[PDB]
Design a binder for these strands. Structure first.
Lengths: 62, 140, 37, 549
RNA sequence: GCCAGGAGGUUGGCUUAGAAGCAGCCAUCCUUUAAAGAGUGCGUAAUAGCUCACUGGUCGAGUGGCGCCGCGCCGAAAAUGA
């Protein structure tokens, strides 16, 4: 299981949501991780791929 | 209720805290030792510090009273002979020098504290206590 | 200490008392409870 | 035997600052118990037996009376620190109205002032009804507890009101397992009406919630109620998500949250390692219902070593959690000692030849690197210098010849661990066009470093902690003892309040499970915080002792 | 043996988280005095306290130590019954 890229913590449980999709990297990359799940909740500050990259609605209060 | 307790300590100027054994001695007192800090610091304002004895009392109805004394002679020589912390070991290294006037005032200042409340002993007395800290002497 | 051939006065507050036949060394704190043996 | 008044009384204003005014005095010390006098409402509730099938309340058996009387007087006079009627009453010599007692007393009581030491005996049913009455007299009602603190859906202050008409707003606590009605949540609401068989929603992680049936543990049997009231307490069924401390409002109920955030801080660190790591992720399912039933502990894995550290706050804590393991989860893990993060370095200036005089096919890849190496303080960082004797070794190796230095550093010459806290330097080299690569002088750097560190005066810098000791002077002397006996030397002692904290140095290997110790020497005055400082050498013998194989 | 004094510079300096007679290097004083140390042990977190040293009060006749010689006593357990 890979991950959704930048901004991780994960340590060793997380419930990494086995997903699915290799690339030209890590002879596997099948069954990814999701953030949000039971751990990770995305990049500390993300402004796009918040469909996996955790972050809710950047409510910058202004 | 608490009837009479005159406990004297060795509280130096600067420390404004009721830290033990000031606690288990002046708690049974109702000690205004925060007034002892702010009245005795200015009492020796010419420097504003140095280690000084004290004495504090309670008069049944919570009544403090502060009684101050005079500086130490080991410090009244680090200022005089110009030591930093001293002359590292009394029997090897020596700093400045004592003669026939500085020791005079080392005895003068501490006239009613040394032991023999008489000048005609004090000079050579702490001049001998000078070799105990290791400060050399000039003899004539 | 406590039972041994060699038995000193070690701490001044001890005494050597030739009791019941043989030499002992008694004190207050019986940790120096020596004895010729 | 040991039963007394003065005992506990005395120990109240010597161990905190309690102001124990008391209202009941026993009849007969040890074995000779038969009843109590009441200096409160002026009576003598006497229980003429043990099991308590037949009691009484006759006046004083002749000898007490005036005894109790003095203390009764105390009460009124003490009540001169509250209103203005009781005080002036003691001035007048006036008799206290039986209810102004209820006043002034309950007043101070709830205001955290007086200390209604109602008392008694259980196994011999003696002194129970009086304190039942004393609960129904001086034990605070929700109406009396000042405005609860909390957050808003937006973020500021809250005003959780008693009012049984306001917005639904609850809190819950205990995670009950049970057969019939399954997951049961033990709750104290706060503010808002909640119907049974209705709906709600978790005001925490956002989860609509269906209340099944409100319940109440009524001693013997559990009773199902029509609804939960704004300020009562109850345990509901369902809510198949709500953990603990979750603020639970209604379906609407302006999505409000609460303030309270507690802390079960760590004190124990025990290691645990299964046979094969197959049983390990198995025990990870075990935790998947261990660290999800009891909040507390932290199942976190040390980086430098394997094995997940089961950390927590209590000796018996981790021990009994470990009982539950081999009991009903059955895990075979020879419960081990926690490992340590071992680093290392050297102690001398070394100069060697990093010559890679090696041609192969014709491409060579050869690198003669000439380093001088310098070492520096345990705490600095990492240093090397842009140190060309003039301009030999190519500038492509400058950001790469040092790599193999930094590379031949992730594993030392001894047992081998990240060798940190050193300067380095260099000075010269040898260069050629095609017979020289980036990784070539990276590797030349590697050889140079292995030689210059194996022959550089070895060492091991084991890590050491700063630990403040939270304890008064007595057991302080004692623990200065202990800590000193733990291969380290303290350094710190700034006088504190109800205690006196000692800042300490202790070698991380030692000081192991210090809580298991400490909580014994001090009997339990407090403990310590795990402030980590830095590392230094183990005394010669501890070095070669770890040279295993 | 008993009573009592048993002190002041002082927390000697040097070290040291602190080393105050008192865990440690140097040292290697001077004075109030009849007499009281830069200390002998215990104890303290380091102070505190206790304490020996020393000198009087009582006392009333012998006492303390160092070496030698003779005989001894511990040192000193194995096997059929002494």
């Amino acid at each position: 299981a890979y991950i959704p890229g930048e901004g991780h913590n994960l340590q060793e449980h997380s419930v990494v949501l086995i997903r699915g999709g290799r690339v030209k990297d890590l002879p596997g990359v099948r069954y990814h991780i999701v953030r949000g799940v039971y751990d990770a909740a995305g990049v500390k500050d993300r402004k796009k791929s918040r469909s996996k990259y955790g972050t809710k609605k950047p409510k910058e209060a202004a | 209720k608490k009837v009479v307790a005159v406990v004297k300590l060795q509280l130096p100027a600067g420390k404004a805290t009721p830290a033990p054994p000031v606690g288990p001695a002046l708690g049974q007192h109702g000690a205004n030792i925060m007034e002892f800090v702010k009245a005795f610091n200015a009492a020796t304002a010419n420097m504003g510090d140095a280690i000084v004895p004290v004495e504090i009392t309670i008069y049944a109805d919570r009544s403090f009273t502060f009684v101050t004394k005079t500086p130490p002679a080991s410090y009244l020589i680090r200022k005089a002979a110009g030591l930093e912390k001293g002359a590292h070991k009394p029997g090897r290294e020596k700093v400045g020098r004592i003669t026939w006037e500085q020791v005079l005032e080392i005895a003068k200042q501490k006239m009613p504290d040394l032991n023999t409340t008489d000048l005609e002993a004090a000079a050579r007395m702490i001049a001998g206590s000078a070799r105990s800290m290791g400060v050399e002497v000039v003899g004539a | 200490m406590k039972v041994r051939a060699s038995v000193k006065r070690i701490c001044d507050k001890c005494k050597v008392i030739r009791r019941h036949g043989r030499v002992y060394v008694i004190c207050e704190n019986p940790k120096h409870k020596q004895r010729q043996g | 035997t040991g039963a007394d008044l003065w005992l506990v009384i005395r120990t109240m204003q010597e161990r905190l600052g309690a102001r124990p005014v008391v209202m009941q005095l026993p009849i007969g010390r040890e074995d000779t118990f038969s009843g109590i006098i009441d200096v409160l409402r002026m009576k003598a509730y006497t229980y003429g037996n043990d099991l308590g099938t037949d009691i009484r309340e006759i006046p004083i058996p002749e000898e007490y009376l005036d005894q109790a009387r003095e203390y009764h007087e105390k009460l009124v006079e003490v009540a001169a620190d509250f209103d203005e009627n009781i005080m002036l009453k003691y001035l007048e010599g006036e008799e206290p109205t039986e209810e102004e007692l209820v006043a002034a007393i309950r007043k101070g009581t709830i205001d955290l002032k007086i200390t209604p030491v109602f008392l008694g005996s259980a196994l011999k049913n003696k002194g129970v009804q009086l304190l039942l009455d004393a609960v129904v007299d001086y034990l605070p009602s929700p109406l009396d507890i000042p405005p609860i603190k909390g957050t808003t859906p937006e973020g500021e202050v809250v005003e959780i009101h008693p009012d049984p008409n306001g917005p639904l707003a609850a809190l819950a606590f205990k995670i009950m397992a049970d057969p019939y009605v399954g997951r049961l949540t033990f709750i104290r609401v706060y503010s808002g009406t909640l119907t049974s068989g209705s709906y709600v929603y978790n005001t925490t992680k956002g989860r609509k919630e269906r209340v099944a049936r409100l319940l109440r543990m009524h001693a013997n049997h559990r009773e199902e109620v029509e609804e939960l009231k704004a300020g009562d307490l109850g345990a509901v069924v369902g809510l198949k998500e709500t953990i603990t401390g979750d603020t639970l409002v209604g379906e609407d109920a302006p999505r409000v949250i609460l303030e309270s955030i507690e802390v079960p801080e760590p004190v124990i660190d025990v290691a645990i390692e299964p046979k094969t790591k197959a049983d390990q992720e198995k025990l990870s399912q075990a935790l998947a219902r261990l660290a999800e039933e009891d909040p507390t502990f932290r199942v976190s894995t040390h980086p430098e070593t394997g094995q997940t550290i089961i950390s927590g706050m209590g000796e018996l804590h981790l021990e009994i959690i470990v009982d539950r393991l081999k009991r009903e989860f059955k895990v075979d893990a020879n419960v081990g000692k926690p490992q340590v993060a071992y680093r290392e370095t050297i102690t001398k200036p070394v100069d060697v030849e990093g010559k890679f005089i090696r041609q192969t096919g014709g491409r060579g890849q050869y690198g003669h690197v000439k380093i001088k190496v310098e070492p520096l303080p345990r705490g600095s960082g990492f240093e090397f210098v842009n140190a060309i004797v003039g301009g030999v070794i190519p500038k492509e190796y400058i950001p790469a010849v040092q790599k193999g230095i930094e590379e031949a550093m992730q594993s030392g010459p001894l047992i081998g661990f990240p060798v940190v806290d050193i300067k380095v330097t260099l000075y010269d080299g040898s260069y050629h066009e095609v017979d020289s690569s980036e990784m070539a002088f990276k590797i030349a750097g590697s050889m140079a470093i292995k030689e210059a560190v194996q022959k550089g005066d070895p060492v091991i810098l084991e890590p050491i902690m700063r630990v403040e000791v939270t304890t008064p002077e007595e057991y302080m002397g004692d623990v200065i003892g202990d800590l000193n006996a733990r291969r380290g030397q303290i350094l710190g002692m700034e006088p504190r309040g109800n205690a006196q904290v000692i800042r300490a140095f202790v070698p991380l290997a030692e000081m192991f499970g210090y809580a298991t110790d400490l909580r014994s020497k001090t009997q339990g005055r407090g403990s310590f915080v795990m402030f980590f400082d830095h590392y230094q050498e183990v005394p010669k013998q501890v070095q070669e002792k770890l040279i295993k194989g």
